[PDB]
Amino acid sequence: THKSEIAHRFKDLGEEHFKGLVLIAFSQYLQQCPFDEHVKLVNELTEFAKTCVADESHAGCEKSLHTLFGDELCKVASLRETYGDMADCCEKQEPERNECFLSHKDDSPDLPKLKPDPNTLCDEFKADEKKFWGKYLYEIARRHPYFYAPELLYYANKYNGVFQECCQAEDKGACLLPKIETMREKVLTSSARQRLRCASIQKFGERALKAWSVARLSQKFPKAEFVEVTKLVTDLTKVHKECCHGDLLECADDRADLAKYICDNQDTISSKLKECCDKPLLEKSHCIAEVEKDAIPENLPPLTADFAEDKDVCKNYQEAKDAFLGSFLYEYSRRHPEYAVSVLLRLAKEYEATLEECCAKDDPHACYSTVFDKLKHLVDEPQNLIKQNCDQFEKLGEYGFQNALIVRYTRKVPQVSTPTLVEVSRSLGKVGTRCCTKPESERMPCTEDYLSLILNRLCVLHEKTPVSEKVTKCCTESLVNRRPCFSALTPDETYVPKAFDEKLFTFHADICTLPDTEKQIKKQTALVELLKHKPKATEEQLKTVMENFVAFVDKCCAADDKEACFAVEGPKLVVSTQTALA
Ligand SMILES: O=C(O)c1cc(I)cc(I)c1O
Ligand SMILES: O=C(O)c1cc(I)cc(I)c1O
Ligand SMILES: O=C(O)c1cc(I)cc(I)c1O
Ligand SMILES: O=C(O)c1cc(I)cc(I)c1O
Ligand SMILES: [Ca+2]
Ligand SMILES: [Ca+2]
Ligand SMILES: [Ca+2]
Ligand SMILES: [Ca+2]
C-alpha cells in the first residue's frame, strides 16, 4: 500500500537507518553547517515522515524526496551567507534545483584534519552511542559528499564495534589506533570508488557504469547466464544512479532489494553466496560486494568462434549492437578473472572499433577474422608497465617512489596546481605498497583498478577550474583510456619555466615541529615547485638537491636554537641549488 514515497521509504528502511541516511544527505549537501543544526533537520523531516506513515494523504506526503529535501535546504537561514550561489538554486524547479545543488558539492573542503584522542572518544561513546555514531556519519559525509551512503552506515556500525571493544581495554590507544588507521584506508578507497561511479555517470552516461558492471559481475559470477548478469546490472546500476543524484532513501531501499534478490537466487548466480546471505542487511550487502569469485564453467568454447570466425558476426552485431557487444564483454570477462576491468572494457572498445570499420568494408570477415591478435597489445601494455614500476618500488620504498611520481607527473603536466600534484603523486605512490607484493593473478586488477580511482580524483579536482588542456584531454576523452592516455604524455618544452618565488622555498623552524605527514608534504610541495621552476633538472642533479635539503633540515632541527640556523643555512641552500641548476 504505497502512495507516499516518504511513508514507503520510512516503512521499508526503518527509523534508525532512515535517520542515518537523512543525516548523511544533509551533511553532504551542507558541508559547512554545525552538527546540531543537521540533527534538527533530520528530526523535523523524520516527524513529517511519521505523520505521513499515519495518513498517506496528509498534505505533502505525495511529494518526491527531492522535493521535500530541497525544500528543507531552501529554508536554511544561513544559506546564502555560508554558500552563496548555492542559494540561487532555490529559484529553480525540480530536477534542475537538485542538479544545481549537486553541482555545489565541495570535493576538497577546507576542514580541520581528523585526529583521534582515545580518551575523549571513548568517553563520548560511553556517554551516548547513537550520537557518536551520528557525528561519525556527519564528519565522514562532510568530507565525502559522494560517499556511497548505505556503505557509510555499514562503516558507522563497524566504527561503533571497534569503540565498543577497545574502550573496555586497558591500553585504549594501542587497541583503537591500529584499527582506526586500517578502517580509514578502507573508507578512503570506498569513497574514491563511488566518486568514480558518479563522475562516470555524470560524464559518460549510464552506459559506462553498466559496461563496467557487466565486466565486474561477469568476473564474480562466471557461471551466471548473460540474462541474469544483465538483470543484476540493471538493478545495481539504478542503485548507483539514485545515490549519485542524492536520493539516499531510495538508493538504500533498492539496494536492500537487490541483496534480497541475490540471496534468493544463489542457485543461478553463485555458490560463493551461502555465507553472505546469512548476515543482517548492511553486512550482507557489503559481503555480497566483496565476495570471492566462483569457479569458471569447466569446458567453455573459445571466444574466437563466435566473435572472429563466425560469418554472421557483422549481421548479429548489426541486429542488436548492444546485446552483441554486451555478450562480447560478458563472455570475455567470465573467462578472465585475472584481467583488470579497465583492460576488459579496453578490449571490448577495441572490438567495437574493429567491427565498426570492418563491417563497412567489401569483405568484412577477413578484416574481423584476426581481431583477437590485434587485441593482444591491450593486455601486453599494462603487464609490462606493472613489472617496470614495481621494480622502482622495490629499491625506493613508498616515499622514494612518490618522489619519482612527483617528478614524472610534474614534468608531465606542470600547469597543474601544486597541492593536487602533490596529493595525486603521493596517492599514486601508495599503489606499490598496496599491490606490488601481490601474487600475479591479482596484480593487474589490483593496480589498474586503483589507478582509475586516483586518476579520477585528478580529473575531478582538475575539472573544477581547469588549467591543463593536456589534463582535460586525458580526463574527458574516454573514461576507459584515462590511464594509458596519461601514461602516454611526454613532457613539454614549450612549457616556459616558472619564475623564481622565494616564498615557495623558504623553510622555518616549524618543520621540525610537524606531524610527519605534514613534513613529507611540505617537502614534496617544495620538490614540485622546484620542478615547475627548473623543468629540465636531471635525476642526479635532483637527487643531490635532495641530499642537500635533508642534510640542511636535519642540521637546523638538531640545534637548540633553530630559527637562527634555518635563518642562515636556508639561503645557503637556495644559493647552492640555484648554482647547481643554473
Ligand atoms: O576519513 C577520516 O577522516 C576518518 C577519521 C576517523 I577519527 C576515523 C575514520 I574510520 C576515518 O575514515
Ligand atoms: O557496489 C555495491 O554496492 C554492490 C551491492 C550489492 I547488494 C551487490 C553488488 I555485485 C555490488 O557491487
Ligand atoms: O604509474 C603508472 O604509470 C603505472 C601503471 C600501471 I598499469 C601499473 C603501475 I605499479 C604504475 O605505477
Ligand atoms: O565498483 C564499481 O562498480 C566500479 C565502477 C567504475 I565506472 C570504476 C571502478 I575502479 C569501480 O570499482
Ligand atoms: Ca575546495
Ligand atoms: Ca528517484
Ligand atoms: Ca523512483
Ligand atoms: Ca523495498
Swiss-Prot record:
List cellular component terms (GO). Answer: cytoplasm; extracellular region; extracellular space; protein-containing complex
Q: Which residues carry this modification: N6-methyllysine?
A: K532
Q: Which residues carry this modification: Phosphothreonine?
A: T82, T418, T420, T544
One example of a Gene Ontology biological process annotation: cellular response to starvation
Note the SS bond partners: C52-C61, C74-C90, C89-C100, C122-C167, C166-C175, C198-C244, C243-C251, C263-C277, C276-C287, C314-C359, C358-C367, C390-C436, C435-C446, C459-C475, C474-C485, C512-C557, C556-C565
User: Mind telling me which Gene3D superfamilies this protein's record contains?
Assistant: 1.10.246.10
Residues with N6-succinyllysine modification: K203, K562
- Keyword Transport listed? The answer is no
List ligand-binding residues for Ca(2+) 1.
Answer: E5, E242, D247, E250
Q: Which InterPro entries match?
A: ALB/AFP/VDB, Serum_albumin-like, Serum_albumin/AFP/Afamin, Serum_albumin_CS, Serum_albumin_N
Q: What does this gene product do?
A: Binds water, Ca(2+), Na(+), K(+), fatty acids, hormones, bilirubin and drugs. Its main function is the regulation of the colloidal osmotic pressure of blood. Major zinc transporter in plasma, typically binds about 80% of all plasma zinc. Major calcium and magnesium transporter in plasma, binds approximately 45% of circulating calcium and magnesium in plasma. Potentially has more than two calcium-binding sites and might additionally bind calcium in a non-specific manner.
Name this protein carries in UniProt:
Albumin
The species this protein belongs to is Bos taurus (Bovine)
Q: What would be the name of the gene that encodes this protein?
A: ALB
